[PDB]
Design a protein around this ligand. Sequence first.
Ligand SMILES: CC(=O)N[C@H]1[C@H]([C@H](O)[C@H](O)CO)O[C@@](O[C@H]2[C@@H](O)[C@@H](CO)O[C@@H](O[C@H]3[C@H](O)[C@@H](O)[C@H](O)O[C@@H]3CO)[C@@H]2O)(C(=O)O)C[C@@H]1O
Ligand SMILES: [Cl-]
Length: 151
Amino acid sequence: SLNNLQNIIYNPVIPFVGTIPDQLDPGTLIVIRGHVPSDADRFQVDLQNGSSVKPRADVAFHFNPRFKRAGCIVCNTLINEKWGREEITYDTPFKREKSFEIVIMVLKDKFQVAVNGKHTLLYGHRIGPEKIDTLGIYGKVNIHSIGFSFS
Ligand SMILES: CC(=O)N[C@H]1[C@H]([C@H](O)[C@H](O)CO)O[C@@](O[C@H]2[C@@H](O)[C@@H](CO)O[C@@H](O[C@H]3[C@H](O)[C@@H](O)[C@H](O)O[C@@H]3CO)[C@@H]2O)(C(=O)O)C[C@@H]1O
Ligand SMILES: [Cl-]
């Protein structure tokens, strides 16, 4: 059959703020397929505790490809409206005008992210993943599909 992921969302409007339909237990996958527009400066995928804007929802995991200069991916955590220490990954596979697949795997102590079938980065948990119930996608990105595999 054609359904290999759960709770699939197709061609969402960006910015996208959606409820994650089950718990992010170890082994859970979040799978996002899309493409970067030619003028992209950045986009972000945020795993959030709720969707409030005041106070702004905590972001357990901010995954933020940036396209200026040589490009990079910045990761961070937002707690009580304050950003923490950035973790920057310089070996970035994202490119303007190219399509991508992001697979975020939740593990016990960290997230692991693979892009286009290749391991890209790790990010240690700073907020318990049990607090995450919302997926936010913002910025200059086109999203084809979002799906989940819940453990
Ligand atoms: C309306 C708007 O522009 N919202 C932005 C916000 C605001 O600009 C910002 O929160 C106001 O302080 O920024 C968002 O991106 C931030 C996020 O990617 C973090 C991750 O660490 O980096 C912030 O920039 C850093 C920069 O990377 C550092 O080099 C610098 O020393 O500090 C900067 C500020 O901390 C980004 O602004 C956000 O999600 O908060 C994107 C929104 O669209
Ligand atoms: Cl782990």
